[PDB]
Subunit: 247 residues, 3 copies
């Protein structure tokens, strides 16, 4: 046989490139996943991830309470933190023993898989009682924020999209929902009657994951890298596996 | 300039009326929210609110367990109350230390924002094992109860709609789901293919809120009134902010 | 009057047969329920049931954590079991005091009501971090497994459909979502614009139930049999109430 890496008959090499190209492009097909991660960063260095993976479209909806840090199997002062909630839903509305709950997220990162169409991304960053803009009567139920999403580039390939905002001020008390639609460069509407009920089933079939990792390093090692997820750390370092046309 | 409140050139006055009219009418546009509140009233005077705010349509789905009172950070006798559940799912099916759990709701109030079309309201008030009418084989999955919803009037304006039923008997052990569709006087179907996928995204983007307030007074002060929500208290007093054509 | 059970004028008998036939056939109408049960079997003999009942379509979505056994009001070693989760999300990723968590399900049974169309059944049996097939880039978000569903026959009538798989190996660490569509032998698309928004409302109105029964016998007695649900026990015994054309 020919010698490896010297001719057009390195079929092992051509198969390896095809395998990676097929995965990248299958992800972008109508049969592929679109994936959303919401990372909540806490002052103790830990990071809650909410992940959802689904066909056609994907979303995550959180309230002020559900984004707060919960240390499973450790002391979370649940009564005091319920009083924090009362005091955050309405000024001077509770009696916690603290000015600022360290369970409040300090930052949110939203990451989409590269199979999303950024023009469809919608976000409702609301107040602590789950109103998009102060009062329901004046509230558009979402903002289209795709123009703020940064590309996560690795080796010249877009491995994901990131929107990141900090919550450093005492009044950064939020509720959060995010939604994005899978790429569809075709004119075949996936939610038109020929396929509409499969989009309803995709709502049933969406797989959700949640975990609080002890720090960004551990998140990077045992979640992002282990499962070929895109990521952007606090030092602006990009993570991901470039696939298209690549060995 | 002209003197305030004497002529047609009080632009400050005309702007104030426009601002309120715009909020009222924006809420009723296809871009606006439709909002649902389910209030569960407990014998100790406290009130659980489940709220959801979303575009196009909105809903809440609860089971018998999820409506029971949970005092966050206090003793809830979780083992005994699990035995209550077993004894409520099937007669003589458990061994709690009590005949009637005081965590069982005594009443439900359903309130919709004025942007709902009452003809679309649907409710599945089921039994304790989440069957609409005793057995699945005979169950229509909802009842259309819009004709029972009372208008919450303030200053002549409908600020919301209310359906209220008490659960005073020992056999009032329910599961509950409610759904309502936003007003659409146009013939443009918001869930037809031109816009269907935005309705799927509205399912992702719906913002949810839940809290147990210690009494109706506190609910009225720090939730209803603070955020311009409609309400109807036990004394048939109406709460809300009239907006259309108003300063 | 005629004597009972001797002539065509036993209207009591004809009414009884009609009543049962009407229930069976109403369940199969577009107005009827389609119901899904996911049973998680634990090594201590207890069984978690997740049930959802809804019109048009129905689904359940679980992750690795949410399928684990939780003994309400008893000791569940929450910190140790969080370390199990970390160690199951990534090999050698945690420090629990145990090799195998007895909270891990040993088997899953999926049961649909007889009103499902098995050709629409979809399942995403994913890994412990909620990926269908190891990596998102290669993942079809579901498998169509209807050909594996066994009919639950009683007295010659299909009272339900069952898919059962064991999780006996240490690497059987799963996430699970299931979806099925109600029968529609007509060509009237229930999710076409004439009725699409009612399918969105059915997403709001779906009633959910969850309980952990102490053993299969108790499940059979106080859940399956009490509410005329189909079931298949470990000894291949079928449970259900045949209805069509029957007294
Ligand atoms: N493209 C390129 N890569 C370089 C160069 N010098 C060092 N490298 C490294 O080599 C890597 C790319 O090697 P290859 O993937 O085999 O080259 P390629 O440009 O992708 O060409 P093909 O894959 O054969 O189509 C890059 O990631 C660089 O880190 C250079 O001059 N050009
Ligand atoms: N309409 C009306 N309001 C009265 C009358 N007497 C006292 N009021 C009070 O005045 C309030 C209404 O005042 P306005 O809003 O300025 O009057 P309006 O009828 O709404 O007329 P415009 O707002 O200027 O279109 C009501 O809420 C009443 O409580 C009365 O005779 N007619
Ligand atoms: N069909 C049938 N059932 C039998 C026979 N022998 C005993 N059985 C029992 O009788 C039951 C059926 O009785 P029926 O329901 O009154 O008879 P059927 O065949 O359903 O006829 P109809 O209901 O009158 O239309 C079955 O469940 C059997 O357990 C037999 O020879 N034929
Ligand atoms: N030294 C080099 N000279 C020429 N081309 C390179 C070199 N290094 C990488 N490339 C090519 O440039 C393209 C982008 O690679 P590059 O490493 O710049 O992406 P990147 O990971 O986004 O870089 P960075 O993260 O440093 O901004 C790839 O196709 C790669 O093959
Ligand atoms: N004394 C009054 N004389 C004439 N019109 C009034 C008077 N008070 C209010 N109105 C007008 O009547 C309309 C309805 O006001 P009203 O206060 O009756 O509503 P409401 O809050 O539902 O009343 P209630 O709660 O007492 O039944 C409004 O347009 C208001 O301007
Ligand atoms: N001994 C019998 N002779 C003739 N027909 C019977 C007899 N027993 C039942 N049948 C009829 O056969 C049909 C199927 O009944 P059968 O009891 O076999 O269903 P099944 O419950 O699935 O049986 P099994 O669970 O034992 O496999 C029914 O219509 C019933 O009336
Ligand atoms: Cl495709
Ligand atoms: Cl509009
Ligand atoms: Cl029908
Ligand atoms: Mg290359
Ligand atoms: Mg006025
Ligand atoms: Mg018979």
């Amino acid at each position: 046989a020919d010698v490896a890496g010297t001719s057009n008959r390195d079929f092992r090499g051509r198969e390896q490139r095809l395998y990676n190209s097929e995965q990248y492009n299958y992800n972008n097909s109508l049969n592929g996943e679109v994936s959303l991660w919401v990372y909540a960063y806490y002052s103790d260095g830990s990071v809650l991830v909410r992940n959802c993976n689904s066909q056609y479209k994907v979303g995550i909806s959180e309230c002020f309470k559900s984004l707060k840090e919960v240390r499973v199997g450790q002391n979370n002062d649940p009564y005091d933190e319920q009083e924090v909630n009362n005091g955050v839903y309405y000024p001077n509305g509770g009696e916690p023993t603290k000015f600022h709950s360290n369970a409040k997220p300090r930052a949110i990162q939203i990451i989409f898989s590269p199979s999303v169409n950024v023009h469809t991304i919608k976000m409702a960053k609301g107040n602590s009682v789950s109103i998009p803009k102060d009062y329901l009567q004046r509230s558009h139920p979402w903002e289209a924020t795709g123009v703020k999403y940064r590309k996560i580039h690795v080796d010249g390939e877009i491995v994901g999209y990131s929107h990141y905002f900090e919550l450093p001020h005492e009044y950064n008390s939020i509720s959060l929902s995010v939604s994005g639609v899978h790429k569809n460069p075709s004119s075949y509407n996936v939610a038109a009657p020929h396929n509409i009920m499969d989009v309803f089933q995709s709502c049933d079939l969406a797989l959700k994951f949640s975990n609080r990792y002890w720090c960004e390093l551990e998140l990077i090692n045992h979640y992002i890298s282990a499962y070929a997820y895109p990521y952007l750390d606090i030092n602006n370092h990009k993570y991901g596996v470039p696939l298209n046309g690549r060995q």
